[PDB]
Design a protein around this ligand. Structure first.
Ligand SMILES: CC(=O)N[C@@H]1[C@@H](O)[C@H](O[C@@H]2O[C@H](CO)[C@@H](O[C@@H]3O[C@H](CO)[C@@H](O[C@@H]4O[C@H](CO)[C@@H](O[C@H]5O[C@H](CO)[C@@H](O[C@@H]6O[C@H](CO)[C@@H](O)[C@H](O)[C@H]6NC(C)=O)[C@H](O)[C@H]5NC(C)=O)[C@H](O)[C@H]4NC(C)=O)[C@H](O)[C@H]3NC(C)=O)[C@H](O)[C@H]2NC(C)=O)[C@@H](CO)O[C@H]1O
Ligand SMILES: *[C@@H]1O[C@H](CO)[C@@H](O[C@@H]2O[C@H](CO)[C@@H](O)[C@H](O)[C@H]2NC(C)=O)[C@H](O)[C@H]1NC(C)=O
Length: 362
């Protein structure tokens, strides 16, 4: 099975032990490590961080002692904005410029492929997205025609039905992509005004779910139904949790909230907590297994957070295997306990390692 793991270029700037550099990554943990994110200037793929070139090499060095490890450079991301992507994939000239600039850039920096993370093509770009992927694969094929190891092309897709229906032509793009990572998380947000796990495996109690499609199981099946070969589908598992600030004494699923949770000491982002920040939170907190959804949530004081732990990711792997999917995708390596000092056991990357172990099991 493939174990696609993301690494973010901005985790390096986190205070103390929060700081994470590519050399802190276990070269044997994943099968594919994707760097996030690359920028796009003058219709050319380009670096984002001032020291990207250094971190690129720092990451690709992991391939020395592990020849099987594959590396990809992802372009896009949430903070990128669909606007910029649209103008490039929409204009016939810019699309060419962009596509042509990718292979050289990847070879120059030691990457094995490109990962498209365009969030998200509007209903107005559904076809342009198809053309982009179609031509990008064409170029990659051409660039390796003489006998090179062909560059890989992947795409991180939304797991939300509405977005999937208006943005993707699953059947068409599945032919050209080497593998698809479905972002099966971020299913519930403070905007909803109630507590809810952002990455449940199944819908669970029919009575308490605001949506029939906001869960991993639905998204996976839907995409399979739409024409995404199971052999090319990688299921996303989050190593971060979504938090909320409770508004009453109610702490169960669906309880009232006043907004996102208090920012974590290291990630400093309201509504977000890295798994390692969660391990701290768990000290003196109560953990509840959500029956039906197969995932846990912890609560302490006026804070509530839905996340994934070793037990839940295990179940999720079981699910993906029973489904015969390509494997699991993790977001992100720098959100897992990479130091291995926060959750005890002195074990590094507990969640990701748990996923790896589960994939090899049975
Ligand atoms: C408004 C309304 O009422 N309408 C409703 C809709 O909202 C509902 O749809 C839902 O919309 C939300 C957004 O509103 C969707 O959420 C997004 O989901 C995607 C995945 O599908 C997420 O993207 C990927 O996952 C991670 C984690 O979520 C993303 O975030 C990381 O990346 C950003 C930048 O790219 C990081 O930002 C960094 O921040 C630090 C400091 O904070 C800074 O120093 C860095 O510089 C900065 N980085 C950069 C480069 O700028 C951020 O910290 C990361 N987060 C975490 C945690 O790690 C990645 O970008 C994505 N990864 C990949 C591989 O692409 C996306 O993050 C998320 N957006 C938000 C705001 O959280 C949601 O999917 C929709 N739901 C569904 C199911 O479709 C709609 C449906 O219910 O209902 C409407 O009514
Ligand atoms: C990524 O590339 C874009 C180019 O599209 C850069 O955006 C420019 O930002 C500067 C201000 O910082 C503006 O003066 C330009 O007009 C912007 N260009 C446009 C039209 O978007 C962006 O700065 C780059 N990001 C990084 C991290 O380097």
């Amino acid at each position: 099975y493939k174990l696609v793991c993301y690494y973010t270029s901005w985790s390096q700037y986190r205070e103390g032990d929060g700081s994470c550099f590519p050399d802190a990554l276990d070269r044997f943990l994943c099968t594919h490590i994707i760097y996030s994110f690359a920028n796009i200037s003058n219709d050319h793929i380009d670096t984002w961080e001032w020291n990207d070139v250094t971190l690129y090499g720092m990451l690709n060095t992991l391939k020395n002692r592990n020849p099987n490890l594959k590396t990809l450079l992802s372009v896009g991301g949430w903070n990128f904005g669909s606007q910029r992507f649209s103008k490039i994939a929409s204009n016939t000239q810019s699309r060419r410029t962009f596509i042509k600039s990718v292979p050289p850039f990847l070879r120059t920096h030691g990457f094995d492929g490109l990962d498209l993370a365009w969030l998200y093509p509007g209903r107005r770009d559904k076809q342009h997205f198809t053309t982009l992927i179609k031509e990008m694969k064409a170029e990659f094929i051409k660039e390796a025609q003489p006998g090179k190891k062909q560059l890989l092309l992947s795409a991180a897709l939304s797991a939300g039905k509405v977005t999937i229906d208006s943005s993707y032509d699953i059947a068409k793009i599945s032919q050209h992509l080497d593998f698809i990572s479905i972002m099966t998380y971020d299913f519930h947000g403070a905007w909803r005004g109630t507590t809810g796990h952002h990455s449940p495996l199944f819908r669970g109690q029919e009575d308490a779910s605001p949506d029939r499609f906001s869960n991993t199981d639905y998204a996976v099946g839907y995409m399979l139904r739409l024409g995404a070969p199971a052999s090319k589908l990688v299921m996303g598992i989050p190593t971060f949790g979504r938090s909320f600030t409770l508004a009453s004494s109610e702490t169960g699923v669906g309880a009232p909230i006043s907004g996102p949770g208090i920012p974590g000491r290291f990630t400093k982002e309201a509504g977000t907590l890295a798994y390692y920040e969660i391990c701290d939170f768990l000290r003196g907190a109560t953990v509840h297994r959500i029956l039906g959804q197969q995932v846990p949530y912890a609560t302490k004081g006026n804070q509530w957070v839905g996340y994934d732990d070793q037990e839940s990711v295990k179940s999720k792997v079981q699910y993906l295997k029973d489904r015969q999917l390509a494997g699991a995708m993790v977001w992100a390596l720098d959100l897992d306990d990479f130091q291995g000092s926060f959750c005890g056991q002195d074990l590094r990357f507990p969640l990701t390692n748990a996923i790896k172990d589960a994939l090899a099991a049975t």
